[PDB]
Design a protein around this ligand. Sequence first.
Ligand SMILES: N[C@@H](Cc1c[nH]c2ccccc12)C(=O)O
Ligand SMILES: [Mg+2]
Ligand SMILES: [Mg+2]
Ligand SMILES: [Mg+2]
Ligand SMILES: [Mg+2]
Ligand SMILES: [Mg+2]
Ligand SMILES: [Mg+2]
Ligand SMILES: [Mg+2]
Ligand SMILES: [Mg+2]
Ligand SMILES: [Mg+2]
Ligand SMILES: [Mg+2]
Ligand SMILES: [Mg+2]
Ligand SMILES: [Mg+2]
Ligand SMILES: [Mg+2]
Ligand SMILES: [Mg+2]
Ligand SMILES: [Mg+2]
Ligand SMILES: [Mg+2]
Ligand SMILES: [Mg+2]
Lengths: 142, 103, 16, 117, 56, 110, 150
Amino acid sequence: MKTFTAKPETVKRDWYVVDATGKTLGRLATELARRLRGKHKAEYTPHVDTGDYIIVLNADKVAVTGNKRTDKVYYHHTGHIGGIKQATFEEMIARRPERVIEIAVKGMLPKGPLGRAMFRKLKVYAGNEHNHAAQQPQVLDI
Amino acid sequence: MYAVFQSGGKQHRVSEGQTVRLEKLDIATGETVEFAEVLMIANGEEVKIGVPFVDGGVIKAEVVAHGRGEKVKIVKFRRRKHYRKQQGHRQWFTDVKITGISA
Amino acid sequence: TSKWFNIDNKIVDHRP
Amino acid sequence: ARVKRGVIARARHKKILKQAKGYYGARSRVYRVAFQAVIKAGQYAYRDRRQRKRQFRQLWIARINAAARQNGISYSKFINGLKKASVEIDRKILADIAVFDKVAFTALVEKAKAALA
Amino acid sequence: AVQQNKPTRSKRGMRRSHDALTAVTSLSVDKTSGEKHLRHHITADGYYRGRKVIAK
Amino acid sequence: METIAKHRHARSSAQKVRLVADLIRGKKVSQALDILTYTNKKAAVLVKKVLESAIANAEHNDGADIDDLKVTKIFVDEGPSMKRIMPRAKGRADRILKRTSHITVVVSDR
Amino acid sequence: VTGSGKKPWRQKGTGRARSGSIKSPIWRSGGVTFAARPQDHSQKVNKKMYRGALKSILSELVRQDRLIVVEKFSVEAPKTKLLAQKLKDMALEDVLIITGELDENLFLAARNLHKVDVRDATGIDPVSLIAFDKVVMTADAVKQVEEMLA
RNA sequence: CCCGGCGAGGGGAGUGAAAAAGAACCUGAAACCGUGUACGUACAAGCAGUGGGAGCACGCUUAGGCGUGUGACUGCGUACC
RNA sequence: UGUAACGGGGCUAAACCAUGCACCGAAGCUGCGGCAGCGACGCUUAUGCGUUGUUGGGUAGGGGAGCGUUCUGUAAGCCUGCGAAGGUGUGCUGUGAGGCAUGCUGGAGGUAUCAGAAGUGCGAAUGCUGACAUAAGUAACGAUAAAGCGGGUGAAAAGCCC
Ligand SMILES: N[C@@H](Cc1c[nH]c2ccccc12)C(=O)O
Ligand SMILES: [Mg+2]
Ligand SMILES: [Mg+2]
Ligand SMILES: [Mg+2]
Ligand SMILES: [Mg+2]
Ligand SMILES: [Mg+2]
Ligand SMILES: [Mg+2]
Ligand SMILES: [Mg+2]
Ligand SMILES: [Mg+2]
Ligand SMILES: [Mg+2]
Ligand SMILES: [Mg+2]
Ligand SMILES: [Mg+2]
Ligand SMILES: [Mg+2]
Ligand SMILES: [Mg+2]
Ligand SMILES: [Mg+2]
Ligand SMILES: [Mg+2]
Ligand SMILES: [Mg+2]
Ligand SMILES: [Mg+2]
């Protein structure tokens, strides 16, 4: 008899709140990505989103290590003429800080279609409160 | 009420009354077989195997016909090297019903 | 028959 | 004795196109194209019969692992336990019980922890 | 300049997604004679906006 | 009653005849005639003659009552094509296929 | 094949395959790579092997008593119906009947009976011995054959 | 007999075992082109399948993660000579 | 050409040294079922079983065994208008080339078995013949001397007639 398969029509999910503050970016991401993919359950289903919605607060106050803060690169290309733009870590935190975490886990979620879908479950708020009371998000450490 | 047992060089989790497909056994079509090599039984609480196998454990079942699986196509092909052979294969099974599960 | 460029020497000879 | 040929021919051809049913465009229409499509499908299968046993094992091991962690223990330690848990042997698939019978699992985790004490 | 591969039967169809025709709907009736006709056009008989112009 | 009519070996491509056919598929016969009547394509006149021949069939041969009568099924299959030759120049030959089509109109009421 | 030996078109230049003779087996009308000729399929068969076979054949016909030998065998007139009756009476349909010296009437009857033939002593061939369901043979013929095979 | 241009072509009628044998006529394959229905498809990147695999439509079976069709999503994967 | 000298995310250990115990990981080893060659041993020898040890990637190429097609015999037999061949589906079966059955189509031939004989198997040769795609309803409609209107005819007139 075939081993089990999660089914999109009937996955659990549930919501959570996480505090970026002192936490070190990436060591955070890891768990976000893991929990985002569902790898802590009957994940047991590569082809299905089985992760949890989880929102992150105080992304601006996220921590880094090393001289990373002034030396991390963050590049992207405009697809134009010769439009290789860049922006240092601090520069990123300055303008739309939520980005830093967002791309940091986006890179750790899988590849393609599903992957992109998993990323939608992560809400990353610069500041402290969040307008998602309705989802009754349960706090969690790590 | 389920229990698991070794038989095909392979284990299976089973409830009684449940039909199950197994590698071929040399037992006549209607007869009854006992599997003494049972790796775990479960009720409200359960006996895992200290060493392998649980002492009192034995799963009882009658064979319920022998058969051959759906044909599978072996294909071998080596590009640009003038070689290929194609070979068909079926694989025997014997189906048992399960009636035991002596906890 | 043949297209004129194929017959013509200047275009056809091109790299000697 | 001249041999008609060609009745046996379309036999060979249709024998292949039938196997190509479902494939896109020429792969299911055009023999010359189909005979290739039909072969490589075969090639992948022969390969992927071996892959199947790989893919599922790591599927099992993946979910064995969360449940173990769920009961506060890594997969590493947890298999080592059951190993050392006075011999005792039990499939990684059959740890199916991780999805359908979580007490039985936790129960398996404890038995494993004990051997590691 | 010429193709390097046969465009597919599918691709052909796609290109023709826009080649389809529109009906009319704006077919309208003369107030005197019965007459269906294109709006702002004389009728078969030579009526237009009730009046009879054109004997033909 | 299905009661059908058709035009075989019509001089037009099919690709062309379709487009005119597609305007009519499923309408009440009454509308189609008007539609065709104000559709500036040679294939319109063709399709009309067929549709008309179909109605008269349905009328004179089976039940009739055109008022409750719709063009339920209409298609055009590509017919045999007349090969010709013309020449574009230097001594080269061009096939040119004068393509033909088999118009078919099925006008029923259910 | 009937055609001239003119090269159909230039070696190089046309976008075409090479082409050499319009009678080429690869081309359509006209070809046949290894056209057959009238041929002789006659095999040898040693003297001693031929005789060796007849013996194995007779010596098997007795062993299935498909050979019934008789003192004299002949029909009284050139009429098929007569012979048909003799066979009927003798319980026979399919028969070889190797006569001693061969007579007119016995031959003309049976010319039209399909499963029955009649041969003189020399006319014995291997397929026939096996062909018919029963070989008759007059005791007179037996002695002829006895010697012919040594 | 009916539509049509005293057309082309067609629908009835009738002949025939058969008209789906109607003269572009035994059989009528394949490339190729359509109409109809089921399912998929408009946030997604590549030899187009293969291993997995939900949903849908359909049959089942008395259920019982079953047959058929489709194939979201997913592991692997650069045709042949 | 664009980060472009960890594959990326990211890492201050998720880097490096040492010691140690885990675990992941292959078509390797083992396990269960199966086939075939060569061995031996036991059941038993015009042999085949049962074990059992062992071997089975493969181009050029050598050896072995086979499927199917056309045609001769076997055959004045056998199948066949209560439906042959061919075509199209479906089920079963074999290790495969295949085979058997049957629905539909078709409307007159087909041939077991064991032998016999070869125009005996196709994807390629810028192969040959035919049919049909593609680019595409795209280029183009052959002198830039030029047409407008009225009236005839006609199913229809920019093009014919006046
Ligand atoms: N008329 C050609 C010249 C030409 C004709 N035949 C040829 C043969 C070979 C080379 C050139 C030509 C041109 O367009 O110029
Ligand atoms: Mg493995
Ligand atoms: Mg000229
Ligand atoms: Mg010559
Ligand atoms: Mg010839
Ligand atoms: Mg001699
Ligand atoms: Mg015909
Ligand atoms: Mg979408
Ligand atoms: Mg694409
Ligand atoms: Mg990509
Ligand atoms: Mg091999
Ligand atoms: Mg034949
Ligand atoms: Mg070919
Ligand atoms: Mg080849
Ligand atoms: Mg060419
Ligand atoms: Mg173009
Ligand atoms: Mg243009
Ligand atoms: Mg133009």
